[PDB]
Design a protein around this ligand. Sequence first.
Ligand SMILES: Nc1ncnc2c1ncn2[C@@H]1O[C@H](CSCC[C@H](N)C(=O)O)[C@@H](O)[C@H]1O
Ligand SMILES: Nc1ncnc2c1ncn2[C@@H]1O[C@H](CSCC[C@H](N)C(=O)O)[C@@H](O)[C@H]1O
Lengths: 284, 284
Amino acid sequence: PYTLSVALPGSILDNAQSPELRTYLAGQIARACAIFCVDEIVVFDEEGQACVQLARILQYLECPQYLRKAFFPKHQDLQFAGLLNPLDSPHHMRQDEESEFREGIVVDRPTRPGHGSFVNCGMKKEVKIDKNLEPGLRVTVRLNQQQHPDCKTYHGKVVSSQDPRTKAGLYWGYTVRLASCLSAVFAEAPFQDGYDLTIGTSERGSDVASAQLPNFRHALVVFGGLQGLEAGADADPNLEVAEPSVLFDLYVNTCPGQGSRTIRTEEAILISLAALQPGLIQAG
Amino acid sequence: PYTLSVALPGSILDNAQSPELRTYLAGQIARACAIFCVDEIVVFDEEGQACVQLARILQYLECPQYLRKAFFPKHQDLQFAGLLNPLDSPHHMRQDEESEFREGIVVDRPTRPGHGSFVNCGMKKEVKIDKNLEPGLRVTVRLNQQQHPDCKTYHGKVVSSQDPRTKAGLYWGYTVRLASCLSAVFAEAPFQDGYDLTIGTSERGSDVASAQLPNFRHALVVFGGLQGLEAGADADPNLEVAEPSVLFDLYVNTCPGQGSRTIRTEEAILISLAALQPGLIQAG
Ligand SMILES: Nc1ncnc2c1ncn2[C@@H]1O[C@H](CSCC[C@H](N)C(=O)O)[C@@H](O)[C@H]1O
Ligand SMILES: Nc1ncnc2c1ncn2[C@@H]1O[C@H](CSCC[C@H](N)C(=O)O)[C@@H](O)[C@H]1O
């Protein structure tokens, strides 16, 4: 049940030429991570509004559409939502789509103790659950197979959000984490033992074709911005290194003989994850 | 000196949400082909203004900026040129950049016979060449090493446009070809013996990791549109097949276990070329 996390700088968005393209770029980052079943995106400050906007946009696209009205008030950072590309991930389904799992928001309707909670799972009727939970929390509902066809609510139980993947093979979205500097990308990892495999990307790294990935459980691929990973490194007072290869288990160039002087970050992610997917599958 | 050609449908542009994004998409196609040193892009009609616009935009970005004013009158298809991303390819260089090769446009200035031609290569002074050529033709000038430092023109000789690559290792741009249907992608190949390796892309193809590419000299990777390669196949009266795998030497899925229902064409190109680059280098 290995994980993959991706770190890019929020400053990527400042290089955009129009506010629309600023949004659209943010959407391209989300789709690339969704395509490769990324579990976590880490938006880090290379030098703070660029990272907030990027993270927010990432969270909006990750969130099942029927839940965005509840989790996202009207925000200026979402003023160009429409011109986006849907993630079309397995938890972004329509209402007339049978599914074993379904994301949900715990509603505010009265319930005597003992009587579980009501959850909006975007179905025709709400879902009554087992546990009594706070009303406004996002949960992962597993629906009862044999339901009670005339009941005014469906029934299911709140399960771990990692159940759809580690149990049914279904990609179920990423989480988004805001990092305040480059060293916080590593130090603030969501996992106890940290990232046991860390992969940095540069045109000065070694050839990906020669790289050998060790067995792992939590992998982090890290991408720089306009100025490369060198900028977040020099900016960070914690770091104090001369060359970024030393902060990573591996420092790879994933496009030998590129035909353009520069690969932009959103292009580098698709190329890098493609070029690493073989080794990532087999090592995990 | 093997070649790689990429075929996509011009209809890709109709799916865009705003005229700006229509342009920007076209720019993403060019950058992806430039990054992987593609030699030829084939824009084919899946069903005709979408393919013309796409081809034109591709030719504009390929063309050294100092030559675009000459080769491109003011066109409505270029009304959003600015919001593009430069290719930044080795033949897109500044004026104070020494280079052995340099693209050029044969100028209109008088010349007695015997006296070669004048070529604008975007330098401080024009270039006098060996041959007497038509005035308005795009050529590839190789500059004389020892030039004559006080002469009012530089000197060089017109060489094959395939010299910068097959001689100095430099990527030197793609050409753009308009195809009228899917079978014209193959039949109208710029090479005598055709494409001896043809690779189709679909989520229904075999796993790229198992594919074995035969030795080759001219390779063509083909990408479908919104409706996949099935649409250009059914539309084309020449074809008359039930499943597209039979039109290609290889039919590959290049993203096992995608996390999104659909990979858009501009995303599929970066992922596919990355996933095939290893085998493409070694086989050619
Ligand atoms: N060939 C390549 N291999 C792997 N990653 C690359 C790459 N080219 C660009 N990238 C990624 O895309 C990001 C932006 S490209 C910025 C390049 C910068 N001028 C520099 O010299 O560092 C980089 O930080 C890197 O993470
Ligand atoms: N997993 C994958 N592997 C290789 N190419 C893919 C791919 N997913 C999408 N593509 C490419 O991107 C194009 C647009 S995606 C269109 C998919 C369409 N619904 C269908 O079923 O065919 C496709 O024509 C294909 O060339």
